[PDB]
Amino acid sequence: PEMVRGQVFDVGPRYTNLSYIGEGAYGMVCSAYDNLNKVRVAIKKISPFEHQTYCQRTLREIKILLRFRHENIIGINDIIRAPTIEQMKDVYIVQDLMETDLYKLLKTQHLSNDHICYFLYQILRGLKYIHSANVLHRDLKPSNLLLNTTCDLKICDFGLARVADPDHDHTGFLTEYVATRWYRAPEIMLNSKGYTKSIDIWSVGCILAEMLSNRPIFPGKHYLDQLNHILGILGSPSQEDLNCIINLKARNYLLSLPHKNKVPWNRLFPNADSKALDLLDKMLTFNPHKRIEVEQALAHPYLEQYYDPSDEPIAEAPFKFDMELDDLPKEKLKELIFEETARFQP
Numbered sequence: 509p510e511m512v513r514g515q516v517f518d519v520g521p522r523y524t525n526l527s528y529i530g531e532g533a534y535g536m537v538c539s540a541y542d543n544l545n546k547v548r549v550a551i552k553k554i555s556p557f558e559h560q561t562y563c564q565r566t567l568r569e570i571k572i573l574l575r576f577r578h579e580n581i582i583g584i585n586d587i588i589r590a591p592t593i594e595q596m597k598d599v600y601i602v603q604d605l606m607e608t609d610l611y612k613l614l615k616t617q618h619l620s621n622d623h624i625c626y627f628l629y630q631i632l633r634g635l636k637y638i639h640s641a642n643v644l645h646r647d648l649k650p651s652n653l654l655l656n657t658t659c660d661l662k663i664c665d666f667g668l669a670r671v672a673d674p675d676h677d678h679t680g681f682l683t684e685y686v687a688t689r690w691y692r693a694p695e696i697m698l699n700s701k702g703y704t705k706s707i708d709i710w711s712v713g714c715i716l717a718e719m720l721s722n723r724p725i726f727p728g729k730h731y732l733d734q735l736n737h738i739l740g741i742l743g744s745p746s747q748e749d750l751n752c753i754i755n756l757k758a759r760n761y762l763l764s765l766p767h768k769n770k771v772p773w774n775r776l777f778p779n780a781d782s783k784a785l786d787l788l789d790k791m792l793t794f795n796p797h798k799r800i801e802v803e804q805a806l807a808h809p810y811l812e813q814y815y816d817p818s819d820e821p822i823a824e825a826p827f828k829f830d831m832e833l834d835d836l837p838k839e840k841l842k843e844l845i846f847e848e849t850a851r852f853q854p
């Protein structure tokens with residue numbers, strides 16, 4: 509088998525001439541030449557079978573992406589693995605080769621307002637499809653947004669996704685870790701399990717702010733620091749918004765803080781389009797029930813040049829419940845991954 513940086517990368521003979529790109533959750537990402545379709549592709553190596561949790565993340569993503577079809581979601585073109593469960597040690601997922609990801613792009617490139625508008629439109633258009641499937645992405649961030657050479661955008665990594673469950677979202681204070689820290693909504697640290705669509709809208713708001721300035725808007729240094737950064741910009745929550753937090757530990761933590769003033773968005777982003785800042789404000793709303801929803805965001809005046817609901821499709825077959833991966837030992841999960849990937853054999 510071909511080898512990349514000392515590690516097996518067993519994709520051949522269809523896929524040749526490999527180059528290292530970067531890193532997925534359970535393995536590396538390479539580009540490769542597809543000798544059948546005569547185009548270069550991206551390939552992610554996954555090695556999950558020694559851990560139940562890794563198998564869960566692998567299976568959820570495969571189940572979701574084998575159903576989803578959308579221009580702003582990077583799909584699965586092929587899946588490579590050994591012909592038998594006994595021999596299967598790794599799984600490789602083959603996807604379109606993009607040019608860069610938004611994390612890397614934002615390290616060195618300033619975006620024009622037209623680019624921010626188009627990128628944000630495409631994020632929300634993809635998100636509308638995801639949420640219409642009753643699914644939450646739950647880890648939206650710049651490195652999960654891929655761009656091709658003409659700046660078409662696709663959303664990557666559904667390994668952390670869940671079926672939405674708003675009626676079971678409440679929990680206690682300082683217990684939840686959903687998403688990546690800088691993109692985590694304030695209620696995750698207060699009283700939410702991350703099972704409502706508003707969790708993703710917050711992340712998109714953080715991404716929009718980051719496109720406006722090339723710096724993360726809420727760069728918490730560690731888990732507990734994150735809420736300091738959010739409140740330092742949004743200011744103290746209103747009485748109404750506190751009254752929506754019935755949990756006493758969370759509400760009393762907020763009541764114990766000194767008053768903090770809101771920082772005006774146009775002072776943080778003096779170059780920004782005023783319509784972009786109005787939408788930013790609605791996405792980064794503290795109260796998740798007041799936070800804008802994906803279809804409202806698409807209709808916002810900032811996006812008027814692109815908005816077209818008839819060209820913003822929804823999912824045919826929403827997911828009705830989570831596949832119930834808890835407590836399934838990794839052995840049954842391996843067998844389920846083997847089964848879900850059979851369509852790509854031989």
Ligand SMILES: *[C@H]1CC(=O)[C@@H](O)[C@@H](O)CCOc2cc(O)cc(O)c2C(=O)O[C@@H](C)C1
Pocket residue numbers: 529530531532533537550551552582603604605606607608609651652654664665
């Ligand atoms: C996309 C989800 C991930 O694994 C992220 O970590 C991602 O940032 C890794 C880099 O993914 C890239 C980068 C590119 O420049 C071009 C690509 O096509 C991809 C890619 O398709 O990533 C997919 C495999 C995973």
